Amino acid sequence: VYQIPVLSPSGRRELAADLPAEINPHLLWEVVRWQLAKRRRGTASTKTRGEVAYSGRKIWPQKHTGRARHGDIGAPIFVGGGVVFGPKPRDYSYTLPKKVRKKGLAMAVADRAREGKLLLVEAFAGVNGKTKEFLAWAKEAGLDGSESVLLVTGNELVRRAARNLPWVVTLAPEGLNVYDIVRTERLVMDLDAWEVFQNRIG
Amino acid sequence: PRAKTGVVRRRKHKKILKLAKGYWGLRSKSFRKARETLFAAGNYAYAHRKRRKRDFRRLWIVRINAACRQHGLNYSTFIHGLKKAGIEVDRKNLADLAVREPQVFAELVERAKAAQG
Amino acid sequence: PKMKTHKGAKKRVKITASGKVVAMKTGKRHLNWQKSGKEIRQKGRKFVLAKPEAERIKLLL
Amino acid sequence: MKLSDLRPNPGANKRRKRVGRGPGSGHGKTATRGHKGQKSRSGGLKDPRRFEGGRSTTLMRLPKRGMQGQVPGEIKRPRYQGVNLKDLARFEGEVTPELLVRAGLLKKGYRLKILGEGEAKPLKVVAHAFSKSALEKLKAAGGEPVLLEA
RNA sequence: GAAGGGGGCCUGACUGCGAGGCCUGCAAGCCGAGCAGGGGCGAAAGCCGGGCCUAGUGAACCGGUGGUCCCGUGUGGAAGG
RNA sequence: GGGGGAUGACCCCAGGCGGUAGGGGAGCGUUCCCGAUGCCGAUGAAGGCCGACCCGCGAGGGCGGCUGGAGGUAAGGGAAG
RNA sequence: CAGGUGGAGCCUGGGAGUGAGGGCGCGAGCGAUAACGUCCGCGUCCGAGCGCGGGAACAACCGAGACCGCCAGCUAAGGCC
RNA sequence: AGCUGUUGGGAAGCAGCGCCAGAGAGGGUGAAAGCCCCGUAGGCGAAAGGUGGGGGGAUAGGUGAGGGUACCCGAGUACCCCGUGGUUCGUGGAGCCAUGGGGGAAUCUGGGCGGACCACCGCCUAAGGCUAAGUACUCCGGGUGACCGAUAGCGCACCAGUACCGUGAGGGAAAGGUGAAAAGAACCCCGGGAGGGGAGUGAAAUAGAGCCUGAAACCGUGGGCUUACAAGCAGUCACGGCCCCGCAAGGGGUUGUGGCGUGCCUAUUGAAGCAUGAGCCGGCGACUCACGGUCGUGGGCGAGCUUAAGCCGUUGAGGCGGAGGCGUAGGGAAACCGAGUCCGAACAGGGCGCAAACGGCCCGCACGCGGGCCGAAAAGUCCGCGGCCGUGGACCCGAAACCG
RNA sequence: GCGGGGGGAACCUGGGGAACUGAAACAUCUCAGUACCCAGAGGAGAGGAAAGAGAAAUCGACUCCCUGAGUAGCGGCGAGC
Ligand SMILES: [Mg+2]
Ligand SMILES: [Mg+2]
Ligand SMILES: [Mg+2]
Ligand SMILES: [Mg+2]
Ligand SMILES: [Mg+2]
Ligand SMILES: [Mg+2]
Ligand SMILES: [Mg+2]
Ligand SMILES: [Mg+2]
Ligand SMILES: [Mg+2]
Ligand SMILES: [Mg+2]
Ligand SMILES: [Mg+2]
Ligand SMILES: [Mg+2]
Ligand SMILES: [Mg+2]
Ligand SMILES: [Mg+2]
Ligand SMILES: [Mg+2]
Ligand SMILES: [Mg+2]
Ligand SMILES: [Mg+2]
Ligand SMILES: [Mg+2]
Ligand SMILES: [Mg+2]
Ligand SMILES: [Mg+2]
Ligand SMILES: [Mg+2]
Ligand SMILES: [Mg+2]
Ligand SMILES: [Mg+2]
Ligand SMILES: [Mg+2]
Ligand SMILES: [Mg+2]
Ligand SMILES: [Mg+2]
Ligand SMILES: [Mg+2]
Ligand SMILES: [Mg+2]
Ligand SMILES: [Mg+2]
Ligand SMILES: [Mg+2]
Ligand SMILES: [Mg+2]
Ligand SMILES: [Mg+2]
Ligand SMILES: [Mg+2]
Ligand SMILES: [Mg+2]
Ligand SMILES: [Mg+2]
Ligand SMILES: [Mg+2]
Ligand SMILES: [Mg+2]
Ligand SMILES: [Mg+2]
Ligand SMILES: [Mg+2]
Ligand SMILES: [Mg+2]
Ligand SMILES: [Mg+2]
Ligand SMILES: [Mg+2]
Ligand SMILES: [Mg+2]
Ligand SMILES: [Mg+2]
Ligand SMILES: [Mg+2]
Ligand SMILES: [Mg+2]
Ligand SMILES: [Mg+2]
Ligand SMILES: [Mg+2]
Ligand SMILES: [Mg+2]
Ligand SMILES: [Mg+2]
Ligand SMILES: [Mg+2]
Ligand SMILES: [Mg+2]
Ligand SMILES: [Mg+2]
Ligand SMILES: [Mg+2]
Ligand SMILES: [Mg+2]
Ligand SMILES: [Mg+2]
Ligand SMILES: [Mg+2]
Ligand SMILES: [Mg+2]
Ligand SMILES: [Mg+2]
Ligand SMILES: [Mg+2]
Ligand SMILES: [Mg+2]
Ligand SMILES: [Mg+2]
Ligand SMILES: [Mg+2]
Ligand SMILES: [Mg+2]
Ligand SMILES: [Mg+2]
Ligand SMILES: [Mg+2]
Ligand SMILES: [Mg+2]
Ligand SMILES: [Mg+2]
Ligand SMILES: [Mg+2]
Ligand SMILES: [Mg+2]
Ligand SMILES: [Mg+2]
Ligand SMILES: [Mg+2]
Ligand SMILES: [Mg+2]
Ligand SMILES: [Mg+2]
Ligand SMILES: [Mg+2]
Ligand SMILES: [Mg+2]
Ligand SMILES: [Mg+2]
Ligand SMILES: [Mg+2]
Ligand SMILES: [Mg+2]
Ligand SMILES: [Mg+2]
Ligand SMILES: [Mg+2]
Ligand SMILES: [Mg+2]
Ligand SMILES: [Mg+2]
Ligand SMILES: [Mg+2]
Ligand SMILES: [Mg+2]
Ligand SMILES: [Mg+2]
Ligand SMILES: [Mg+2]
Ligand SMILES: [Mg+2]
Ligand SMILES: [Mg+2]
Ligand SMILES: [Mg+2]
Ligand SMILES: [Mg+2]
Ligand SMILES: [Mg+2]
Ligand SMILES: [Mg+2]
Ligand SMILES: [Mg+2]
Ligand SMILES: [Mg+2]
Ligand SMILES: [Mg+2]
Ligand SMILES: [Mg+2]
Ligand SMILES: [Mg+2]
Ligand SMILES: [Mg+2]
Ligand SMILES: [Mg+2]
Ligand SMILES: [Mg+2]
Ligand SMILES: [Mg+2]
Ligand SMILES: [Mg+2]
Ligand SMILES: [Mg+2]
Ligand SMILES: [Mg+2]
Ligand SMILES: [Mg+2]
Ligand SMILES: [Mg+2]
Ligand SMILES: [Mg+2]
Ligand SMILES: [Mg+2]
Ligand SMILES: [Mg+2]
Ligand SMILES: [Mg+2]
Ligand SMILES: [Mg+2]
Ligand SMILES: [Mg+2]
Ligand SMILES: [Mg+2]
Ligand SMILES: [Mg+2]
Ligand SMILES: [Mg+2]
Ligand SMILES: [Mg+2]
Ligand SMILES: [Mg+2]
Ligand SMILES: [Mg+2]
Ligand SMILES: [Mg+2]
Ligand SMILES: [Mg+2]
Ligand SMILES: [Mg+2]
Ligand SMILES: [Mg+2]
Ligand SMILES: [Mg+2]
Ligand SMILES: [Mg+2]
Ligand SMILES: [Mg+2]
Ligand SMILES: [Mg+2]
Ligand SMILES: [Mg+2]
Ligand SMILES: [Mg+2]
Ligand SMILES: [Mg+2]
Ligand SMILES: [Mg+2]
Ligand SMILES: [Mg+2]
Ligand SMILES: [Mg+2]
Ligand SMILES: [Mg+2]
Ligand SMILES: [Mg+2]
Ligand SMILES: [Mg+2]
Ligand SMILES: [Mg+2]
Ligand SMILES: [Mg+2]
Ligand SMILES: [Mg+2]
Ligand SMILES: [Mg+2]
Ligand SMILES: [Mg+2]
Ligand SMILES: [Mg+2]
Ligand SMILES: [Mg+2]
Ligand SMILES: [Mg+2]
Ligand SMILES: [Mg+2]
Ligand SMILES: [Mg+2]
Ligand SMILES: [Mg+2]
Ligand SMILES: [Mg+2]
Ligand SMILES: [Mg+2]
Ligand SMILES: [Mg+2]
Ligand SMILES: [Mg+2]
Ligand SMILES: [Mg+2]
Ligand SMILES: [Mg+2]
Ligand SMILES: [Mg+2]
Ligand SMILES: [Mg+2]
Ligand SMILES: [Mg+2]
Ligand SMILES: [Mg+2]
Ligand SMILES: [Mg+2]
Ligand SMILES: [Mg+2]
Ligand SMILES: [Mg+2]
Ligand SMILES: [Mg+2]
Ligand SMILES: [Mg+2]
Ligand SMILES: [Mg+2]
Ligand SMILES: [Mg+2]
Ligand SMILES: [Mg+2]
Ligand SMILES: [Mg+2]
Ligand SMILES: [Mg+2]
Ligand SMILES: [Mg+2]
Ligand SMILES: [Mg+2]
Ligand SMILES: [Mg+2]
Ligand SMILES: [Mg+2]
Ligand SMILES: [Mg+2]
Ligand SMILES: [Mg+2]
Ligand SMILES: [Mg+2]
Ligand SMILES: [Mg+2]
Ligand SMILES: [Mg+2]
Ligand SMILES: [Mg+2]
Ligand SMILES: [Mg+2]
Ligand SMILES: [Mg+2]
Ligand SMILES: [Mg+2]
Ligand SMILES: [Mg+2]
Ligand SMILES: [Mg+2]
Ligand SMILES: [Mg+2]
Ligand SMILES: [Mg+2]
Ligand SMILES: [Mg+2]
Ligand SMILES: [Mg+2]
Ligand SMILES: [Mg+2]
Ligand SMILES: [Mg+2]
Ligand SMILES: [Mg+2]
Ligand SMILES: [Mg+2]
Ligand SMILES: [Mg+2]
Ligand SMILES: [Mg+2]
Ligand SMILES: [Mg+2]
Ligand SMILES: [Mg+2]
Ligand SMILES: [Mg+2]
Ligand SMILES: [Mg+2]
Ligand SMILES: [Mg+2]
Ligand SMILES: [Mg+2]
Ligand SMILES: [Mg+2]
Ligand SMILES: [Mg+2]
Ligand SMILES: [Mg+2]
Ligand SMILES: [Mg+2]
Ligand SMILES: [Mg+2]
């Protein structure tokens, strides 16, 4: 995909990008599965019959009692007993092939460009971290908060400015991940952020 | 996450308890005795649907074998008559004809013994 | 945990290039004051069959 | 592309086998373990790959690989790894046992020995040993040193 | 029409192998042409890798004994394999 | 299974379709997560009690009435006490 | 060598369950030309067809292999005071 | 940084015009609030006590070359032997470190070690002591959750290690919810009270304090149908009556007669079986997870594939990290050789091993060739998913017992 | 005059130290230097500045993680470690 519109105070030029021809919605899905898997807290636990509080004493003789047949009340048959095969803390992360992380990141951008919802811009002008100021610049740029925007820029102040918009997820350039791209309709980067993203792939 | 029984079990029990409406004693009150009964009723219906077909034909025959015994005739011969008479009608079911349309039956009796007498 | 190679198996069995399990031949070093020279001589290696599938499975690693 | 659009390809994500549930599930009651005794029991059987039910197993064959090692351990000695001519046919310049690791053929713990299979090339190939067939194959084109320093 | 009886020389009661099969759950058990080495009997064709045949048998492990190349824990040996 | 190039889930045609231990294949529902700064909701959430109605082979899903009085959560996916 | 396209055959692999059978017929052994006895062989059914018809009732004798519906028809065994 | 109108018991809902945002996390407020309340982003704060591994400053302390002398260099010690322990080493060829017993040195030309022993070549200086950090844990405080939500979660959400049981060690529970607000029902009537009936509060009082929702077993009151010459796994298929709904045809309820009819589960060759289990209802209750392996499968990259621990980064943002692993060569006990190798005297024989797959574009003669190219595919490897296996309590429950 | 004494969830070092179980019996082996008892320490404890490694004329205290590696070996050469 090559037809990507840059945005300078001089005029809305056009930049050409390499970006893969076709996308792989599976690989894309695979990366997202991973991104959300690793961030899992894996913090759900339960107690086994050995970790329960009760004594180990046999509850009744075992014969001639006329009752059923038991050992300790920490057994899972008992109400208040241990839990069979319940959850313990565990690490849901795995190591998704790096060559795949790249691809997916690339394709995710491509897909956005392929539909023209991608946009590179320059210096903004609506900086000095104030949402009203950005919000003003955003207007003059087309972003009217009619669709969700993923703002990728290294500039600390611009992010402060956008952060609080319920339709804006703002992110640093080294933070570019595919999940955030696919949640947001529009993709808006600056040039000093397209460069880093450019060197990430390949 | 823990998925407790919640609401599911009570529902399945309600479904069957409703199908067991009108049954005797617990067979309509206890989910268990109800489900056992339904098993029974399930096979009875199925078997009894296949033998409802029998029980009627049986009836039709008796009805017929009587109306043509009025005209001096074995059901057994009457049928053979119509067989050779070409008359693949009667459809034994249609012997209310023998009850609603006597004259129309009598005429059939004639065409009956007419062939192979 | 890490599975453990079966040292008894490793000491007396070999896996070939094509995944065959090649073992020595039984019954030739103990009671041969005279078995036929043909008998004692026919002791090279052989191939276990459809049950080296099991031997293979305790060496894997 | 959208979050409600992701999903994966047909398979890739099969549905675990939830057995021991209800009938017509296919695997209920006996939970696919079929009545039985030992195997159906919890801890189940001993270990099929070895246990033969009391009879001597096939631990009845005699080790040959005589020399199993003794207590101080494995004896240090130069291990040679062979790489074929066909393999290094991709290189043009030098070829040193060092370079051949980076390429992904040598492996760091072994000394270099080039073998026959393949066709030679007019380059300077540095190694620890050469195969009969290999020394000839390339002597008809290029030149090659033998290593033994430090 | 010998596998039985008699005599003459001899030791193939060989070494290195083995096409192909019998049997067979495994492991075993069985038969075996042919090639090579060096032989025995025979004029020769040839036969000979014990015995008319089918029982006289014991996986592995652990050690003993005689060889032989092979390994020998810094190295030469040695210990031990 | 073979057709008719809709290529499915369409119409044809012809066959198979008892079933325990078991193998295989499709689905239904429960809890939780993304979808959610969203959407449904006091003109009434969840749950409950009816139903002769609608959809699905079935598991179920609807819809309507009464109760209840504050939650619920699509499509598409993900994970399991 | 031919016919035989069949929930046939063969090859490689993943998953099994079974390794307590039983009645009957036929062929033998054991037993007493005893057992609803026992042990094999070849078949069959029940097992898993305790679904359907006949046999008064009755897993295995006779008939017959139940996808679903019909207040239609022909039959099987067996029957028709 | 927000007011108004509107429905409503209640506005935060809907509507109309606005505003803040370095703050659109969240929790309250009569229902659903960025802008009402508490917070949130961003900042700020210690007289006193604790800390202070960071910056600064002191003090202790530390720092020479050559030549000669042979003075010192950790004793019941090294060393040897017997008995044992530790190490992967279970007496093994058994070293090393430790030491209960016996014997018992030396001080640089001294001693220990490199897996019996000897030589050679090297390593190191035993028998005195101290030493931050990187590491382990969580009574305690905090922050997070594809963690529980009152049979769950700690044994305990509630004055629980309590009641209660036990001589004692010890065992050990149950038990949460009116309403937005007590406005928690003055007074009157029946009653000894309890309780109820009016009145009254409330949006609601089958929200009335044995209080949210209020299922099932279970017990009642009323009504429809039905039953005292019929006999049975209780149903089912038919007809008919009577009651209800509907214009309608149809349907719902009940059951008089007729036909058919051996509960469920389990275990068995075989069960209605006079074989096991179950009074009934509600809730709890059993194929898991980790790490390896072996298949299959979805993808990535392919003679390559891939990182681990860590480091950096981080609104639940990713990246770096190539130690390492698997694969690319096999055969042999090994030395070793190698597309071969092993057995062998063999240039017999055999064992186990090596052999680039398609299309198409280029050329050497034209229809392929011969070898190359362009990329389809792929050995291999990596992650996900699924079957199964190994090890772990490994589907859940249950002993008689053993030991501290 | 100075100090000790006793207590602390787990963690740590030391002194002692099982059995069930596994080996589909059992004694060596395993479980396991585990459980547990005792002493002691502290916010940590241990360890620590080579009479070390071990084949490289090599490295340089100790602790901890990854790897080396289920390798080297150990082993009724069994189970297994
Ligand atoms: Mg306890
Ligand atoms: Mg307790
Ligand atoms: Mg316990
Ligand atoms: Mg006890
Ligand atoms: Mg009882
Ligand atoms: Mg309790
Ligand atoms: Mg609990
Ligand atoms: Mg997993
Ligand atoms: Mg990970
Ligand atoms: Mg990481
Ligand atoms: Mg935002
Ligand atoms: Mg449940
Ligand atoms: Mg009825
Ligand atoms: Mg019929
Ligand atoms: Mg006819
Ligand atoms: Mg002999
Ligand atoms: Mg499935
Ligand atoms: Mg199945
Ligand atoms: Mg089944
Ligand atoms: Mg199975
Ligand atoms: Mg069972
Ligand atoms: Mg059995
Ligand atoms: Mg049993
Ligand atoms: Mg158990
Ligand atoms: Mg067991
Ligand atoms: Mg035995
Ligand atoms: Mg003779
Ligand atoms: Mg002679
Ligand atoms: Mg052969
Ligand atoms: Mg023999
Ligand atoms: Mg003989
Ligand atoms: Mg043994
Ligand atoms: Mg020996
Ligand atoms: Mg030996
Ligand atoms: Mg030597
Ligand atoms: Mg050494
Ligand atoms: Mg030596
Ligand atoms: Mg020896
Ligand atoms: Mg020897
Ligand atoms: Mg088609
Ligand atoms: Mg059909
Ligand atoms: Mg079927
Ligand atoms: Mg299938
Ligand atoms: Mg589902
Ligand atoms: Mg959300
Ligand atoms: Mg609304
Ligand atoms: Mg209202
Ligand atoms: Mg309502
Ligand atoms: Mg819910
Ligand atoms: Mg419904
Ligand atoms: Mg409702
Ligand atoms: Mg209401
Ligand atoms: Mg939802
Ligand atoms: Mg729901
Ligand atoms: Mg879903
Ligand atoms: Mg469960
Ligand atoms: Mg043929
Ligand atoms: Mg078949
Ligand atoms: Mg097969
Ligand atoms: Mg298999
Ligand atoms: Mg048996
Ligand atoms: Mg048997
Ligand atoms: Mg038998
Ligand atoms: Mg049979
Ligand atoms: Mg039979
Ligand atoms: Mg019988
Ligand atoms: Mg006869
Ligand atoms: Mg008999
Ligand atoms: Mg019998
Ligand atoms: Mg027969
Ligand atoms: Mg059976
Ligand atoms: Mg039958
Ligand atoms: Mg059958
Ligand atoms: Mg019966
Ligand atoms: Mg019957
Ligand atoms: Mg009958
Ligand atoms: Mg019958
Ligand atoms: Mg059929
Ligand atoms: Mg049919
Ligand atoms: Mg007829
Ligand atoms: Mg007939
Ligand atoms: Mg009769
Ligand atoms: Mg009003
Ligand atoms: Mg207002
Ligand atoms: Mg508004
Ligand atoms: Mg925020
Ligand atoms: Mg309300
Ligand atoms: Mg509220
Ligand atoms: Mg709202
Ligand atoms: Mg809303
Ligand atoms: Mg608020
Ligand atoms: Mg508002
Ligand atoms: Mg702050
Ligand atoms: Mg202040
Ligand atoms: Mg501060
Ligand atoms: Mg201070
Ligand atoms: Mg300092
Ligand atoms: Mg300082
Ligand atoms: Mg000084
Ligand atoms: Mg001096
Ligand atoms: Mg001096
Ligand atoms: Mg000293
Ligand atoms: Mg010594
Ligand atoms: Mg010594
Ligand atoms: Mg000693
Ligand atoms: Mg020892
Ligand atoms: Mg021993
Ligand atoms: Mg030894
Ligand atoms: Mg030793
Ligand atoms: Mg020792
Ligand atoms: Mg020594
Ligand atoms: Mg010592
Ligand atoms: Mg000593
Ligand atoms: Mg010296
Ligand atoms: Mg040393
Ligand atoms: Mg040495
Ligand atoms: Mg000695
Ligand atoms: Mg040293
Ligand atoms: Mg010292
Ligand atoms: Mg210290
Ligand atoms: Mg805490
Ligand atoms: Mg929950
Ligand atoms: Mg909740
Ligand atoms: Mg409770
Ligand atoms: Mg509780
Ligand atoms: Mg509750
Ligand atoms: Mg606690
Ligand atoms: Mg409790
Ligand atoms: Mg308390
Ligand atoms: Mg008392
Ligand atoms: Mg007391
Ligand atoms: Mg309550
Ligand atoms: Mg309240
Ligand atoms: Mg409230
Ligand atoms: Mg009064
Ligand atoms: Mg009152
Ligand atoms: Mg009132
Ligand atoms: Mg009022
Ligand atoms: Mg009301
Ligand atoms: Mg009242
Ligand atoms: Mg109510
Ligand atoms: Mg009440
Ligand atoms: Mg209420
Ligand atoms: Mg109550
Ligand atoms: Mg409430
Ligand atoms: Mg209530
Ligand atoms: Mg009544
Ligand atoms: Mg009478
Ligand atoms: Mg009467
Ligand atoms: Mg009676
Ligand atoms: Mg009845
Ligand atoms: Mg009726
Ligand atoms: Mg009616
Ligand atoms: Mg009747
Ligand atoms: Mg009846
Ligand atoms: Mg009857
Ligand atoms: Mg039984
Ligand atoms: Mg029995
Ligand atoms: Mg029996
Ligand atoms: Mg009974
Ligand atoms: Mg009994
Ligand atoms: Mg019973
Ligand atoms: Mg029993
Ligand atoms: Mg039972
Ligand atoms: Mg009983
Ligand atoms: Mg009772
Ligand atoms: Mg229940
Ligand atoms: Mg796994
Ligand atoms: Mg797997
Ligand atoms: Mg950091
Ligand atoms: Mg491998
Ligand atoms: Mg090799
Ligand atoms: Mg090898
Ligand atoms: Mg040789
Ligand atoms: Mg040789
Ligand atoms: Mg050869
Ligand atoms: Mg070959
Ligand atoms: Mg490919
Ligand atoms: Mg692949
Ligand atoms: Mg398992
Ligand atoms: Mg137990
Ligand atoms: Mg005791
Ligand atoms: Mg102290
Ligand atoms: Mg103390
Ligand atoms: Mg003390
Ligand atoms: Mg200790
Ligand atoms: Mg200790
Ligand atoms: Mg002590
Ligand atoms: Mg000790
Ligand atoms: Mg023991
Ligand atoms: Mg075991
Ligand atoms: Mg045992
Ligand atoms: Mg055992
Ligand atoms: Mg025993
Ligand atoms: Mg041990
Ligand atoms: Mg202590
Ligand atoms: Mg620390
Ligand atoms: Mg320390
Ligand atoms: Mg120390
Ligand atoms: Mg020192
Ligand atoms: Mg030093
Ligand atoms: Mg040995
Ligand atoms: Mg050990």
3-class SS string, B63-95: HHHHHCCCCCCCHHHHHHHHHHCCCCCCCCCCC
What separation in angstroms does the CA of D75 have from each of C30, D7, D72, D79, D107?
Answer: 31, 56, 9, 11, 20
CA–CA dist D19, D32 (Å, integer): 7
Decide: D102 and D94 in contact? Cβ < 8 Å.
Answer: no
CA–CA dist A183, A5 (Å, integer): 21
CA atoms within 13 A on the CB side of D114: 29
CA–CA dist D33, B100 (Å, integer): 66
Q: Compute CA B82 distance to the chain's CA centroid, rounded to the nearest angstrom.
A: 25
SS3 A189: strand
According to DSSP, the residues that pair with A186 across neighbouring strands are A149
CA–CA dist B21, B55 (Å, integer): 27
SS3 B17: helix
**Residue D146 backbone dihedrals phi, psi, to 5 degrees:** -105, 145
Q: Locate A8 and state its tokens.
A: 């300078």
Residue A66, by phi and psi: left (phi above 0), alpha (psi -120 to 50) or beta?
Answer: left
What is the stated resolution of the deposited model, in angstroms?
3.1
C26 touches chain D (CB under 8 A): yes
D42 CB below 7 A from strand I atoms: no
Contacts C11 to D, Cβ<8 Å:
63, 65, 68
**Residue C44 backbone dihedrals phi, psi, to 5 degrees:** -100, -150
Q: How many CB atoms lie within 10 A of CB A21?
A: 9
CA–CA dist D80, D40 (Å, integer): 51
Chain C residue nearest residue D64, CA to CA: C12
Strand order in the sheet with D129-130: D80-84, D111-115, D129-130
D55 touches chain C (CB under 8 A): no
Q: Compute CA D112 distance to the chain's CA centroid, rounded to the nearest angstrom.
A: 20
CA/C1' separation D30–H148 (Å): 31
Read off the DSSP letter of residue B28. G
Pick from A88, A108, A87, A115: which is nearest to A35 by CA?
A108
According to DSSP, the residues that pair with A8 across neighbouring strands are A11
